[PDB]
Amino acid sequence: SGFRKMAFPSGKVEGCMVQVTCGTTTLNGLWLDDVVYCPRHVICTSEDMLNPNYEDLLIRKSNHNFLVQAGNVQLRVIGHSMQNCVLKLKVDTANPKTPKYKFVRIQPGQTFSVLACYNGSPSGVYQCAMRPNFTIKGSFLNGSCGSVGFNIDYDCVSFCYMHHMELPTGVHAGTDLEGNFYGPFVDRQTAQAAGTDTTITVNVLAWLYAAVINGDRWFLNRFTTTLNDFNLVAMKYNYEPLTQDHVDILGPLSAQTGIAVLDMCASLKELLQNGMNGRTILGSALLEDEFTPFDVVRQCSGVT
Amino acid sequence: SGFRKMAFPSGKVEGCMVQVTCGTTTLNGLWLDDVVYCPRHVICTSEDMLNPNYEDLLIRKSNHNFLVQAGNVQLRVIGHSMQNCVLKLKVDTANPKTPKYKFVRIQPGQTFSVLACYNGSPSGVYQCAMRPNFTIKGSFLNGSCGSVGFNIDYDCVSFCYMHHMELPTGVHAGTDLEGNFYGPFVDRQTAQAAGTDTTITVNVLAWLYAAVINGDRWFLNRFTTTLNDFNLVAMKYNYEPLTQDHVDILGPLSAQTGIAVLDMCASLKELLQNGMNGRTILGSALLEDEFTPFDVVRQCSGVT
Numbered sequence: 001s002g003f004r005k006m007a008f009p010s011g012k013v014e015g016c017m018v019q020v021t022c023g024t025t026t027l028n029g030l031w032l033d034d035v036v037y038c039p040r041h042v043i044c045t046s047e048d049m050l051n052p053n054y055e056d057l058l059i060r061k062s063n064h065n066f067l068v069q070a071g072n073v074q075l076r077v078i079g080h081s082m083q084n085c086v087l088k089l090k091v092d093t094a095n096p097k098t099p100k101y102k103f104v105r106i107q108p109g110q111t112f113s114v115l116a117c118y119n120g121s122p123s124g125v126y127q128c129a130m131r132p133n134f135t136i137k138g139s140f141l142n143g144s145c146g147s148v149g150f151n152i153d154y155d156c157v158s159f160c161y162m163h164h165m166e167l168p169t170g171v172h173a174g175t176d177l178e179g180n181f182y183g184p185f186v187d188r189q190t191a192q193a194a195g196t197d198t199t200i201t202v203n204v205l206a207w208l209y210a211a212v213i214n215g216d217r218w219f220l221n222r223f224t225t226t227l228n229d230f231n232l233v234a235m236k237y238n239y240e241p242l243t244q245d246h247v248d249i250l251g252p253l254s255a256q257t258g259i260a261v262l263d264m265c266a267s268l269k270e271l272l273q274n275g276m277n278g279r280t281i282l283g284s285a286l287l288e289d290e291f292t293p294f295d296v297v298r299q300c301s302g303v304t
Numbered sequence: 305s306g307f308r309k310m311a312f313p314s315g316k317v318e319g320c321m322v323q324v325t326c327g328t329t330t331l332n333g334l335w336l337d338d339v340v341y342c343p344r345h346v347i348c349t350s351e352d353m354l355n356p357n358y359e360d361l362l363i364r365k366s367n368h369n370f371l372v373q374a375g376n377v378q379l380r381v382i383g384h385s386m387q388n389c390v391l392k393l394k395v396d397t398a399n400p401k402t403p404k405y406k407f408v409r410i411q412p413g414q415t416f417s418v419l420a421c422y423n424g425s426p427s428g429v430y431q432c433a434m435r436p437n438f439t440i441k442g443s444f445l446n447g448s449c450g451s452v453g454f455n456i457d458y459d460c461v462s463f464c465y466m467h468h469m470e471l472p473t474g475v476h477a478g479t480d481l482e483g484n485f486y487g488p489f490v491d492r493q494t495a496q497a498a499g500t501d502t503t504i505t506v507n508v509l510a511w512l513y514a515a516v517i518n519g520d521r522w523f524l525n526r527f528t529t530t531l532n533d534f535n536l537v538a539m540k541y542n543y544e545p546l547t548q549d550h551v552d553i554l555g556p557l558s559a560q561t562g563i564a565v566l567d568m569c570a571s572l573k574e575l576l577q578n579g580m581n582g583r584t585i586l587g588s589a590l591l592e593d594e595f596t597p598f599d600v601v602r603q604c605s606g607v608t
């Protein structure tokens with residue numbers, strides 16, 4: 001019973017968080033095996049951030065200029081390299097708490113948990129989604145850079161995000177663990193506007209199935225629709241177009257509830273056209289799009 | 305930038321979760337020092353749950369009947385006792401991962417993080433509030449009993465909740481770590497209705513201050529009110545009465561933003577009377593009451 005915006009347990013990621021200082025800039029690093037991963041803008045001064053030439057700035061840096069502290073103890077840096085927008089600091093010690101892990105580049109609409117950190121220490125954990133405009137609506141302050149986004153399959157942590165920057169609109173941008181930014185963002189202090197933040201339709205449908213499973217059924221109607229009819233409505237409301245791939249992934253939810261995907265699409269269509277009329281669905285007065293079909297299945301089935 | 309329903313990092317609590325089996329019933333236990341804490345209904349069969357006499361049921365149980373498994377290894381039970389609605393299983397081994405901890409009984413309106421678990425394994429973490437009717441709106445399935453609610457001050461974990469039951473309305477009830485239920489709930493399969501779930505006014509005000517700090521200011525008006533005038537409106541909308549104690553705790557938020565508490569109360573009054581008019585505040589179309597003033601300060605300042 002009940003449905004919550006739930007994050008993965010953060011313990012396995014907490015054991016990886018370290019503090020990286022270069023010059024007077026301190027941010028978070030991710031220590032897996034004998035490598036510490038951190039945003040390359042750690043080498044920048046606020047002056048450098050306007051038009052940084054990271055290759056040129058990195059030439060002035062040596063292994064001893066990167067101060068890596070894991071808890072209250074210092075790690076010895078025996079190598080450094082830049083891979084896209086991340087720095088990989090080879091340390092002389094393998095992280096004893098390194099969990100089984102993968103580096104994955106997620107697609108827009110996918111969700112993950114963020115372990116927000118400051119000075120290498122965790123402050124909190126929350127669930128995010130990679131928006132269709134490749135930004136994330138997180139909660140990050142100065143010093144939070146290097147905090148990571150991740151998913152967990154039983155004992156394997158799939159790192160998908162590393163926080164790099166706050167856009168002038170208060171939304172967030174970052175890279176995968178190979179240093180490649182999601183979206184067109186660049187690590188520089190230049191105004192970069194985000195594109196249209198469309199609603200993740202397949203996620204809203206999954207959350208509507210979760211509402212049905214949990215007893216919120218007032219929005220179920222006597223209608224059906226087609227993928228083409230639904231998508232005409234979705235385009236009008238800045239929702240992502242629904243494909244047969246989305247319908248397929250909603251299959252287990254449709255089977256669990258006995259509500260055909262296109263019937264749920266018609267309920268969503270009426271909710272978009274008529275609004276909630278002061279009502280709520282799973283304690284929300286708006287259509288939630290940050291639960292994937294997999295998240296709804298996982299939460300509703302108790303996967304650990 | 306940004307404001308999220310953030311939970312405390314769950315690592316320190318993950319290292320305490322164990323599986324407790326008694327007969328054919330398996331639930332979660334909390335292992336701190338050489339004691340495993342779990343709901344006493346672990347000794348019950350589904351037949352016993354209608355009118356259980358826990359003292360009588362416990363007489364038929366011996367130390368060897370409580371199977372405690374921490375990860376894949378078995379803990380030896382050398383003692384057992386019932387304290388209110390929890391069982392304390394003395395084991396022969398102190399939990400090596402026991403963090404600094406306290407057992408606290410929270411007040412309604414206070415928030416905490418829940419590490420939902422099944423078979424002693426964590427499935428996720430989310431932020432909750434003890435509702436004014438002493439229920440919690442969680443996300444729990446069968447097998448989640450014994451999952452705990454907690455807060456963390458730097459390195460000390462204050463355990464405040466242990467999950468015991470789901471009321472017929474899909475809301476949740478449980479105890480503090482001394483076995484005392486929050487509210488009038490009893491651990492038996494009897495329909496127990498919850499009281500009025502009023503809105504935590506001081507929390508809504510704190511979340512309105514967090515919205516101002518993060519750029520959402522459309523709801524700020526040209527009005528003020530008094531505590532008595534505000535409370536007349538609050539009574540009408542099933543909001544908790546606001547006291548000078550609440551105003552005092554909102555002091556740091558009022559000082560940070562330069563918005564007097566009673567001016568924010570007047571904004572809240574207009575939001576209650578007029579509604580949001582299709583608008584949102586911190587990505588929500590309703591007034592969020594599960595962030596305390598301390599949570600807003602902590603999140604907005606980066607406390608780790």
Ligand SMILES: Cc1ccncc1NC(=O)Nc1cccc(Cl)c1
Nearest residue numbers: 041140141142164165166187188189
């Ligand atoms: C101040 C803050 C708040 C939240 N998240 C992140 C930050 N820091 C931040 O954006 N620094 C920065 C500025 C320009 C470019 C780059 Cl790559 C980094």
Ligand SMILES: Cc1ccncc1NC(=O)Nc1cccc(Cl)c1
Nearest residue numbers: 345444445446468469470491492493
């Ligand atoms: C099924 C479930 C789902 C979520 N949370 C908890 C549960 N289990 C649950 O309530 N068991 C139970 C039944 C009667 C009395 C008592 Cl004390 C316990």
